[PDB]
Symmetry: D2
């Protein structure tokens, strides 16, 4: 160790400074995913499908994930429309063996995984915690939205380390930074705050072989928010600086930014796409 500058963050970086990637001098080339394999969980759903389709547009092979809604037709659509390889996989991400077995099969079928989006999740819809005496629903949120995200990260991390490269994006939420109102949802906020800081912690630990970042969406027009009445949505609009909910298409730019070589010095960051909601 004499004769080396040793990192205070992660000695597995080796003697410092590490060396910067060789990048195209053209900014547009940086956003390409040509020759790359992406795996997007929760990709039978709103945000996941938008991101998955966009990764296919950028040139990537895409592994689609679903649980209770088969998305084989979505994978088939990606191959016929963009000519990339795509397949759909059924997995309950609360089951850690099933996560391990799904990702291991994806690595076999696609050869590798370059980009991973840990996106599947469920909401809390039962109002204030004080009145839910039964711990099933807390356990459901923690299992899927926190433990399941860690199962995906821990297994994909081993592939990134073997190959020496990778980009992990975790879908967090503004709920990891603020407390949603008027719908009270403490267990979901707790899990998403944990997701956001897990991303920062893994960014440190994986730095020799991968980048880890989060997207924190605001209110996005998907079916996840269909439990909400008109008067509750109206209050969301009143508190959003842009004055509306976002579209799933307004998120894909950030997911592509983080997945691609546009962001090779970006790690441990939280990219907020929320119409300004976290500012007031």
């Amino acid at each position: 160790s004499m004769g080396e500058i040793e990192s205070y963050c992660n000695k597995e970086l080796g003697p410092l400074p590490t060396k910067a990637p060789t990048l195209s001098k053209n900014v547009l080339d940086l956003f390409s995913l040509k020759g790359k394999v992406a795996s997007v969980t929760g990709s039978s759903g709103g945000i996941g499908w938008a991101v998955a389709e966009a990764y296919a547009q950028a040139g990537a092979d895409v592994a689609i994930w679903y649980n209770s809604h088969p998305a084989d037709e979505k994978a088939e659509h990606l191959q016929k429309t963009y000519g990339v390889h795509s397949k759909a996989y059924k997995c309950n991400i609360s089951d850690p063996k099933s996560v391990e077995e799904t990702i291991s099969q994806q690595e076999k079928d696609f050869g590798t995984i370059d980009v991973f989006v840990a996106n599947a999740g469920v909401t809390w819809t039962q109002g204030p915690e004080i009145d839910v005496d039964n711990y099933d629903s807390w356990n459901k949120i923690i299992s899927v939205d926190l433990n399941g995200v860690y199962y995906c990260s821990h297994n994909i991390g081993k592939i990134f380390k073997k190959n020496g490269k990778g980009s992990l994006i975790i879908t967090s939420s503004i709920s990891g930074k603020i407390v949603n109102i008027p719908q009270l949802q403490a267990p979901y906020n707790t899990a998403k705050a944990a997701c956001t800081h897990l991303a920062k912690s893994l960014a440190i630990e994986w730095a020799p072989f991968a980048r880890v970042n989060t997207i924190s969406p605001g209110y996005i027009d998907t079916d996840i928010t269909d439990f909400a009445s008109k008067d509750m949505k109206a209050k969301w609009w009143q508190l959003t600086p842009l004055g509306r909910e976002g579209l799933t298409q307004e998120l894909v730019g950030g997911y592509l930014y983080l997945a691609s070589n546009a962001s090779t010095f970006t790690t441990g960051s939280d990219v907020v796409i929320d119409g300004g909601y976290t500012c007031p």
Copy 2:
């Protein structure tokens, strides 16, 4: 509800504005805890014992909690030295049924609970997650440092709501806001970030009847974190603006601040006591 100003945060506040409490004319009397009962989990250990003793000095009856290290002589020390009432209770906070019984008994023994400090926890010590394939380590952290905190909160909140008053303090960590180095501990950091934001979420939901805040200590010279290696501690000191670890006696003022009527407008706050560590 015509004519009432209804909260966007919590309609159980009633028609706004809510009304402020009467408070002592003298600032020093605001910190008094006589007439109050406090319950401090993990008060076998370093921080918990310091807080428990400080609360007795302020005049509170204090319920001591332990798991593997019986603390009855601690409770009887509080009895003897300060003339308050005190009893020690054995509880595994990862078991929700035992948490409920312990809280229920304390309410029976002391009459009520005014102040609750959710402080018990364990560290992660196994280095980088990517080399730990038993999820048992991950599960143990989450079940004690996150689930167990939620079990305590869910039960004590019902007492606060019955009585219409209460202060809940959660011991989080600087690890919920930053990523510790060089000792990598992503599971612990994730759990503590969850605790910090659970605090903020419960502050909104419980606002009609209680305040909820957290203390985020830095490196504190308890027995646990003093068997780590010279070279590790030295790096912590180099990155701490005050240049040293903290004493447990440097935490008790923040815990008394949040427990007492000195902080009646303070809720959802995170008090960092870390020698400046989160600043660089």
Copy 3:
């Protein structure tokens, strides 16, 4: 330098670790300001007078500051009521020579300054910036609320360094963390965010001889908010988890905490007293 652990933050700490203060084992004694001199700017106003009176209650000599409203009668009241030394000083804090001359005279009249509260400030009341084409009002906010705070800090810092001890508290605002609505006040928010990060920066630089912290109040019932109509206050209440504005008396506990030996490991922190406003 061989044979020393050198700080990465501030080599003027000397060889590490620095040594912890010897504190009373009784938590109540930690909050005393007996034998200490405090200087509170803006102390003809609401928050400043409450803090000043409270510091006198805790045992401190108090230097009162005013600009357009003489507060000699307030200083006289402190001496007749609590028996401490107190005098009032007229200073326009936008004037850096006047700041220097006031603090230098206070050090002569009182012997030293142990605690300094940089609290004087003015609000922006002119609505959205886009319609204020004239830069007077931006310049007014920056001069008083930012430059004036630095003039006080820079001059008091020299006294703390000479004596090797001190505590600086800056009154910031939730406006340094969030964007107030519906009253649009970008220049004030900008200055208060600067105040909050100046506190963290000075905490690093002054660490060998002083602590620096901020209080960030929410909406407090003083005359600073009298420009606001009932329908605007009502929206503030709707967005505040506690459902009301705070009282000045609800801030003094935090100002005493930071001023006293209750907080000797607390530096660079921002203590938010806002009824939970920053949580949603």
Copy 4:
């Protein structure tokens, strides 16, 4: 206003909800800037030139700004290489009258301004503030790094509001969120924190007609910060999770993200590009 949902943030949004834009079907086309005019201050220097060239690659007409280092050959390089239109402008951004004239001329020369990057700035280099008694250093930082940014924003916002569209990007710094060490620079950190929160405040006020975001770079290998000392840089590397400084080419993707229609729901956001530095 009966029957309308009125914003709590900004009533000039009109009756809510506001309406979303039509966007390209293909994610890659979202990043296009053809048909757009961009104005990039400080584009003599490292970061500004990189951004200006990246915007021309994306198809934008680009206005170059300089002060002491004429950049007409830079603008003519953009002319020659990309076929866009480009001109360089000499302006001292600490002088508000010259900022207004420069912005006015650019509007006349190019027809409009769609994208504005407020990027010009200077560092603090004089070590700890407490030893610097000329406020000239403090004043120079504030006047260029804060006041000058506000002058650019105030003027360009009127163009955006006239046209009903626009994207403003402010170059802040990791220094607005953390305190750099070992080089102490409180004045600069304070100014950059002000820029970050000015961004957030202007995002709310301008929301009916523009987005406002900031990029917060870490240590970037520009000429300015490469003449610092070996031992200083080595400490930066040791505390950076990626183990190195960033290249200016690692920033341009974030600037293009925020400038383009890839980020139409992104406002008030701070994109950290710092190799993970703010995480430990």
